[PDB]
Design a binder for this molecule. Sequence first.
Ligand SMILES: [Zn+2]
Length: 260
Amino acid sequence: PMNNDEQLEFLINYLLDERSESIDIPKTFSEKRNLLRSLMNMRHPSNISEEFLRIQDEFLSRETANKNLTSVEDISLSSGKIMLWQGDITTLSADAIVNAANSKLLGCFIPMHNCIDNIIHSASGLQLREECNRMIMLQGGDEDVGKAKITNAYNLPSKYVVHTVGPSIERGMRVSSDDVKKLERCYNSCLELASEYKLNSIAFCCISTGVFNFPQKKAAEIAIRTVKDFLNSNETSLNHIIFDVFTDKDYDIYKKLLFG
Ligand SMILES: [Zn+2]
């Protein structure tokens, strides 16, 4: 019964066999780990060995348990039902985390790319892309901006992942009212679906910032307002909405707006 390094070798070797190739297995653990992520990032969704899945799960679950995990009650920075936390969303045991997805909803196919979509899929497992693929098959095509779908979170410490597609801003364009309205719809759709599943806590990433080029201050102002308007006007199971920010800049913006 394999150790941690044998599990990692096994997973890498299986994915390389599937491609009919062979690179030289890197030296350092962290090199091989990055090879695994790349291989996972690129795998188009399809039937896969259950032996692989079992080993993937032991491997990724153990990785999850060796991170420093955060529970919702550990977050000290809060205003009523709203919380603000700077940290890695794959280490937060909210009922649901929000994935800022794209319209194909299969995650990120670019190896090592450090968008949240990539990071979430990398830590969750290949099953997340598969579950997403099925919801695409069933609806008969691509996901529109401003909606929300819920999946299992697999080897993350959260129970569910909620996938939403935000608007993108053309380079050098000002944000328009259409753009704002779409981003409000992302937040609301997430909040409504979480309410319908009776979740207690949900964590948002900064939807549409980064790759989709939405300006960070305006995005925050919209995220905060939409969440607040939703809480002020619905009876909801939700008691904790967490704004999970990764950058120092996002932290400073949300902090000033919520507490400053
Ligand atoms: Zn990406």
